[PDB]
Amino acid sequence: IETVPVKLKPGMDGPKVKQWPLTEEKIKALVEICTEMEKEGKISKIGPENPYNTPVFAIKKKDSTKWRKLVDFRELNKRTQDFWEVQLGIPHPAGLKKKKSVTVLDVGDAYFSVPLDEDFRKYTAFTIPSINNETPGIRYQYNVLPQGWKGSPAIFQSSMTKILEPFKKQNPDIVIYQYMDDLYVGSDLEIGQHRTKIEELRQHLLRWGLTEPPFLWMGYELHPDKWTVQPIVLPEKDSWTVNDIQKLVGKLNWASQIYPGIKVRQLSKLLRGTKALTEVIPLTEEAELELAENREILKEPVHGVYYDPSKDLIAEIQKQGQGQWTYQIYQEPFKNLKTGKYARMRGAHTNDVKQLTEAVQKITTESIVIWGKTPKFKLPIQKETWETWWTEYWQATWIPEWEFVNTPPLVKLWYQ
Amino acid sequence: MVPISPIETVPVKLKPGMDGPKVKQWPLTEEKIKALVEICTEMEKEGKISKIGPENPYNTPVFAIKKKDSTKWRKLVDFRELNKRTQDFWEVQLGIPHPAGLKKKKSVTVLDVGDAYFSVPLDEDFRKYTAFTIPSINNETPGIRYQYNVLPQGWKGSPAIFQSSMTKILEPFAAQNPDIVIYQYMDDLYVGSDLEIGQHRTKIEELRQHLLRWGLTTPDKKHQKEPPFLWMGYELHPDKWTVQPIVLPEKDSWTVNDIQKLVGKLNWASQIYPGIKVRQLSKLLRGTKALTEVIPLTEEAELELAENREILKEPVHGVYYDPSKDLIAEIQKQGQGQWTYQIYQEPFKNLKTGKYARMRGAHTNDVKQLTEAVQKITTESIVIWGKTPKFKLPIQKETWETWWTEYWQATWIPEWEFVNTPPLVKLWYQLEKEPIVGAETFYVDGAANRETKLGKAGYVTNKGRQKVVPLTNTTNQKTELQAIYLALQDSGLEVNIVTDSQYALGIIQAQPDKSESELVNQIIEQLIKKEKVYLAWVPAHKGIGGNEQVDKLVSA
Numbered sequence: 012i013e014t015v016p017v018k019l020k021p022g023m024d025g026p027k028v029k030q031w032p033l034t035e036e037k038i039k040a041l042v043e044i045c046t047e048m049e050k051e052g053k054i055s056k057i058g059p060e061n062p063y064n065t066p067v068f069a070i071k072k073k074d075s076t077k078w079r080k081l082v083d084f085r086e087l088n089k090r091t092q093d094f095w096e097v098q099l100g101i102p103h104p105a106g107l108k109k110k111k112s113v114t115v116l117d118v119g120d121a122y123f124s125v126p127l128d129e130d131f132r133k134y135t136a137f138t139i140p141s142i143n144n145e146t147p148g149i150r151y152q153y154n155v156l157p158q159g160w161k162g163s164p165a166i167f168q169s170s171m172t173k174i175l176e177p178f179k180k181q182n183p184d185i186v187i188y189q190y191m192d193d194l195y196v197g198s199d200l201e202i203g204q205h206r207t208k209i210e211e212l213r214q215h216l217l218r219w220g221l222t223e224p225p226f227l228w229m230g231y232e233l234h235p236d237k238w239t240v241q242p243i244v245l246p247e248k249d250s251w252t253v254n255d256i257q258k259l260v261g262k263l264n265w266a267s268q269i270y271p272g273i274k275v276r277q278l279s280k281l282l283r284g285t286k287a288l289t290e291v292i293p294l295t296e297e298a299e300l301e302l303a304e305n306r307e308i309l310k311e312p313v314h315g316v317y318y319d320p321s322k323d324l325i326a327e328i329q330k331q332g333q334g335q336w337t338y339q340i341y342q343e344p345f346k347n348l349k350t351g352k353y354a355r356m357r358g359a360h361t362n363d364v365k366q367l368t369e370a371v372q373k374i375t376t377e378s379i380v381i382w383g384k385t386p387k388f389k390l391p392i393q394k395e396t397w398e399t400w401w402t403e404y405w406q407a408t409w410i411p412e413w414e415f416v417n418t419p420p421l422v423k424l425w426y427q
Numbered sequence: 428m429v430p431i432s433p434i435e436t437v438p439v440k441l442k443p444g445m446d447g448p449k450v451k452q453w454p455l456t457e458e459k460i461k462a463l464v465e466i467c468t469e470m471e472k473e474g475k476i477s478k479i480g481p482e483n484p485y486n487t488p489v490f491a492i493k494k495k496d497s498t499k500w501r502k503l504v505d506f507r508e509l510n511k512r513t514q515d516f517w518e519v520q521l522g523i524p525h526p527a528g529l530k531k532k533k534s535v536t537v538l539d540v541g542d543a544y545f546s547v548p549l550d551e552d553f554r555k556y557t558a559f560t561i562p563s564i565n566n567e568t569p570g571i572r573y574q575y576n577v578l579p580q581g582w583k584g585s586p587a588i589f590q591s592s593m594t595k596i597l598e599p600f601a602a603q604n605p606d607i608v609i610y611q612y613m614d615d616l617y618v619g620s621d622l623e624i625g626q627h628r629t630k631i632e633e634l635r636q637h638l639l640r641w642g643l644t645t646p647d648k649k650h651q652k653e654p655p656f657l658w659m660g661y662e663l664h665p666d667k668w669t670v671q672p673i674v675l676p677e678k679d680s681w682t683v684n685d686i687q688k689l690v691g692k693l694n695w696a697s698q699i700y701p702g703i704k705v706r707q708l709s710k711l712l713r714g715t716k717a718l719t720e721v722i723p724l725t726e727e728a729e730l731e732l733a734e735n736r737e738i739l740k741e742p743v744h745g746v747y748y749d750p751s752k753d754l755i756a757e758i759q760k761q762g763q764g765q766w767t768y769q770i771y772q773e774p775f776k777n778l779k780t781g782k783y784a785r786m787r788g789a790h791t792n793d794v795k796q797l798t799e800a801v802q803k804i805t806t807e808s809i810v811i812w813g814k815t816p817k818f819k820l821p822i823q824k825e826t827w828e829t830w831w832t833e834y835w836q837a838t839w840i841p842e843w844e845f846v847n848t849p850p851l852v853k854l855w856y857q858l859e860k861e862p863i864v865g866a867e868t869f870y871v872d873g874a875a876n877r878e879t880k881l882g883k884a885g886y887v888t889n890k891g892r893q894k895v896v897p898l899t900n901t902t903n904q905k906t907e908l909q910a911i912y913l914a915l916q917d918s919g920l921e922v923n924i925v926t927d928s929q930y931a932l933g934i935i936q937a938q939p940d941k942s943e944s945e946l947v948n949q950i951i952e953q954l955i956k957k958e959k960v961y962l963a964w965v966p967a968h969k970g971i972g973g974n975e976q977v978d979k980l981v982s983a
């Protein structure tokens with residue numbers, strides 16, 4: 012009921028990002044949504060004295076049938092102060108990634124019950140564009156905590172802790188983490204009781220809501236205890252061709268950047284002469300011994316690998332074909348914090364970009380659970396292809412950063 | 428007196444930390460002073476300005492300009508300094524409608540809203556910054572000091588505040604008359620409809636009755652402007668549109684400036700005239716920007732210009748948008764990285780046309796360029812019609828499926844169908860996934876001395892075939908490519924090639940069919956001639972014989 016004072020970072024003005032073009036159905040969806048929000052007092056029309064802008068579009072969450080307003084606050088979030096006045100920062104729950112079931116709740120509608128600092132509202136300006144610029148764009152700003160803004164969960168945390176206090180004491184083994192508009196609720200119980208342990212929460216904040224949230228009903232369920240990784244594996248063969256040994260030596264040489272004692276000279280010594288690529292080469296016992304020792308090395312963890320919260324996380328993705336994708340998360344090169352692989356690209360058998368878009372969201376979700384922040388992606392795609400299509404398949408309420416890779420890396424072979 | 432609603436005032440600020448202008452008033456002739464006194468007296472009676480006391484410390488220079496072929500003077504207040512310190516505004520006319528997205532209208536009226544412009548009040552807290560001084564006669568009395576009460580002509584915020592004020596006034600009239608459309612441009616409102624002309628102008632008089640609420644008057648004697656309209660470079664007609672006439676000059680010699688207008692006119696004409704090309708004419712301007720320098724037009728540029736003259740020989744018209752029908756977009760390859768396209772709903776009746784030019788890079792292929800053209804047309808179509816068109820593309824379904832399933836990047840193009848109009852886009856070579864049995868294996872390598880530029884390139888094979896060629900004025904990267912070139916030249920239709928060059932792999936794995944490097948282009952033409960090529964990579968200096976043997980042969 013009292014507004015918390017919020018200001019931008021020193022020497023920075025509000026965001027001035029161009030609205031990108033929207034299809035007719037997203038425009039009309041945004042008109043319907045924003046008309047109701049204006050009636051409910053959440054937003055207000057603004058005049059031409061407001062020069063700031065933040066892009067807006069519309070999505071449909073996973074198996075939901077009605078549109079959700081999504082604002083790309085990435086620039087405003089970069090320009091907003093970081094909130095340490097009450098809390099030095101919530102220590103990320105390292106136990107969340109260890110629970111066998113984690114449900115993600117869209118508690119973003121709860122932020123609309125808290126007013127926004129009136130001096131900061133001008134910076135949340137957004138524009139519903141018109142087709143072909145045949146009418147002026149509908150200009151709004153927020154009067155309450157907006158979804159997608161990093162300051163919304165920081166300010167509302169005062170409240171949120173008190174809402175779930177009856178639940179946290181009733182259930183002291185449940186790990187609850189809040190990231191932006193998401194609430195991650197982890198437990199080790201039985202599946203049937205897990206839902207049972209989700210609706211109870213849900214019914215709480217609907218009880219604080221009547222003293223209706225348009226997306227609180229839904230639960231995106233994960234199982235981080237069964238999150239599989241990707242160690243480095245070498246082939247097991249009875250017949251090695253020249254080509255097989257060349258690929259093996261090339262892979263072991265790349266792993267030697269990660270591991271300490273990798274060795275390839277016995278294997279390379281078999282490649283003595285100028286032999287046909289398909290010719291079978293018997294392994295000497297020095298070569299098999301060397302291969303066996305490299306195999307043992309690759310089963311241990313990597314040396315000197317630690318997460319530093321003061322540094323960015325970086326996610327690389329490789330297209331492997333046949334609907335398969337590999338990814339590695341790291342902070343310094345060759346110090347992977349997590350590696351993985353996806354053949355589970357849903358409803359996109361004929362669409363590369365939809366698959367990549369679902370993989371990005373999948374990797375971001377894992378990154379939030381593990382470290383409590385999103386990585387910067389290096390995407391194997393042209394900027395012009397990605398920026399044309401990714402909003403068509405986006406179903407998350409956050410948006411990470413990304414850059415584009417235009418030169419094919421050799422590293423695809425080593426995770427293949 | 429019929430009460431009139433006031434127009435809501437827009438609050439205006441200066442830029443943070445900035446103060447208002449304090450510019451000194453130029454001296455003026457006694458003739459100009461008497462002119463400005465009479466002009467400013469009329470505007471004071473009209474309420475546009477008001478005399479102020481000496482406490483206001485701000486000032487903006489005012490001038491008197493003698494009009495051509497007239498004995499009357501005009502007034503010009505130079506707000507350049509005040510504009511530098513006025514806050515930024517939300518400007519709404521950054522995006523302007525494209526005629527291809529408009530709808531057919533039976534009747535279109537134009538109403539002048541110039542007197543309505545002065546009923547818009549300036550923010551009272553901001554008026555002090557608009558102060559100006561008329562110099563007195565002989566500098567013997569204090570100058571007459573005025574400040575604006577309305578949006579001053581030439582002030583930074585006047586266009587944005589004016590249209591946003593009109594939009595707010597017009598919103599209920601437009602929302603409760605969904606059978607008309609209203610569009611504002613400069614000092615004119617445009618009202619269009621499909622109503623029979625009788626009802627169309629009751630709606631016009633209903634619009635003038637609605638504007639009276641705020642005391643906004645429109646001329647009784649109706650406007651002189653009527654279809655067709657000359658608007659932002661187009662010709663708008665009731666059921667068709669076109670750019671204004673494109674006339675290409677006749678010149679025996681062309682300068683740097685002469686070509687930038689020609690390409691400009693051609694770029695403008697390309698939105699309705701199909702097949703306009705500007706490559707060979709734009710190339711004549713690369714690097715140099717000397718406005719006066721005359722450029723010999725290559726016979727390539729002369730042919731391109733002559734081809735454009737033939738296309739521009741007559742008016743070409745496009746139609747308006749029908750939301751009840753599909754959008755179709757059709758693309759053709761033109762060569763040298765040029766692409767042209769037509770967007771229509773019914774055959775032979777284009778809504779608009781356009782072109783796309785290859786980006787600047789070291790290597791490229793036709794499939795990548797066609798993909799980029801699709802994305803450009805997709806985004807333009809979202810802008811203009813709010814939808815993606817169905818595409819007709821000069822590429823076989825089998826070629827596209829082979830491309831995107833094997834390409835290392837993710838790629839996608841929306842719903843499309845093959846159209847068989849040459850030159851077709853195709854894949855010119857496909858590297859093998861596994862080594863080829865029965866094919867000779869070529870171990871290639873190259874090296875160069877970074878000081879003398881002297882190098883060697885060559886290969887050794889499993890059949891005992893060998894070659895080393897000495898080279899001058901080369902680099903390590905170029906010798907690694909030449910070695911691959913030699914192995915392709917000297918092998919049969921199927922060949923395995925082993926290299927340690929990460930640089931060569933990165934180029935060939937990008938799958939170009941054309942390059943800026945004449946050595947890469949030669950490799951491409953060898954790849955086209957082959958039936959099977961397997962390209963394998965090994966690391967350098969690692970005991971891998973064949974590689975090590977030729978490593979010593981070329982690094983000696």
Ligand SMILES: Cc1cc(/C=C/C#N)cc(C)c1Oc1nc(Nc2ccc(C#N)c(F)c2)nc2ccsc12
Binds near residue numbers: 532608655
């Ligand atoms: C009425 C109008 C006038 C102008 C005046 C320009 C000048 N000089 C400009 C725009 C953008 C105008 O706005 C529109 N026009 C049209 N259709 C159209 C159809 C036929 C003619 C003719 N003849 C025409 F003028 C316009 N559809 C729409 C749909 C939403 S607004 C709009």
Ligand SMILES: [Mg+2]
Binds near residue numbers: 873
């Ligand atoms: Mg070498």
